[PDB]
Write a protein that binds this ligand. Structure first.
Ligand SMILES: [Mn+2]
Length: 269
């Protein structure tokens, strides 16, 4: 299984900088934003930057890449925040298409599940996206009016659409799926409801919150409540050809810790 982190695109290196950092760190997959997640403004992507990104990626393994939509996106919003969210996600998809990034992942949002599906489909249409890139919807911690806590709901969300799913282990744990003590059972449930063939990317986040706590607080590998449970997910034979992305604080110390754990686990495949 491939593994990586969420890398920065800020600075003079732009998105090309992320490709370089992935190679430097020795990652086998990576994730980036298509623009600052703190603002709705789209980030200009020049043809030269597109060429650099593609050339750099292809020259060093063509590592699978994922573009994460901003947390600002809420496809379940009833108000005009919906239009802003749909347009922002369409931008992510358009940028991904230009860069040759195969996946864009977004959280469902909060509200009526039907509104979320409507939003996801509208974004795909606005972006004029074909079979590529593929939009992935993540399962969530649930609670309140958050959509996607149950795998069965996600299965309905992607039914009759080209949407696929991104499993987040922290979200699942927070929602009530015992990834810590029954990681195999959680994957069995996901395969029955959604089908693992439609889960190309896994956000292998550990959790600060407890089982069914509805708390969405990511933790580094081995530093949360799931612990070695994530090892069982990472090494499950059914996911051996998937992409695993950790979404936690970045830095030399943090990265070294996480890479040492990922690599130790990989040796146990
Ligand atoms: Mn989260």
């Amino acid at each position: 299984p491939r593994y990586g982190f969420h890398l920065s695109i800020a600075g003079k290196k732009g998105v090309a900088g992320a490709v370089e950092e992935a190679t430097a760190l020795g990652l086998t997959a990576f994730q980036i934003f298509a623009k600052s997640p703190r603002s709705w403004r789209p980030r200009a992507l020049s043809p030269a930057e597109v060429e650099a990104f593609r050339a750099l990626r292809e020259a060093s393994g063509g590592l699978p890449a994922v573009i994460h939509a901003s947390y600002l996106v809420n496809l379940g919003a009833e108000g005009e925040l919906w239009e802003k969210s749909v347009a922002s996600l369409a931008d992510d998809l358009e940028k991904a298409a230009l860069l040759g990034v195969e996946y864009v992942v977004v959280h469902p949002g909060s509200g009526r599940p039907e509104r979320v599906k409507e939003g996801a489909l509208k974004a795909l249409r606005l972006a004029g996206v074909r079979s590529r890139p593929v939009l992935l919807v993540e399962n969530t911690a649930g609670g309140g009016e958050k959509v996607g806590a149950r795998f069965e709901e996600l299965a309905w969300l992607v039914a009759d659409t080209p949407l696929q799913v991104c499993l987040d282990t922290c979200h699942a744990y927070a929602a009530g799926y015992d990834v810590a003590e029954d990681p195999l059972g959680v994957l069995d449930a996901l395969d029955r409801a959604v089908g693992l063939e439609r889960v190309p990317v896994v956000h292998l986040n550990d959790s600060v919150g407890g089982l069914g706590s509805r708390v969405d607080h990511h933790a580094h590998l081995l530093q949360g409540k799931i612990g070695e449970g994530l090892k069982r997910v990472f090494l499950d034979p059914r996911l051996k050809d998937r992409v695993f992305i950790l979404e936690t604080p970045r830095g030399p110390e943090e990265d070294a810790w996480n890479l040492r754990v990922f690599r130790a686990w990989l040796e146990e495949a």
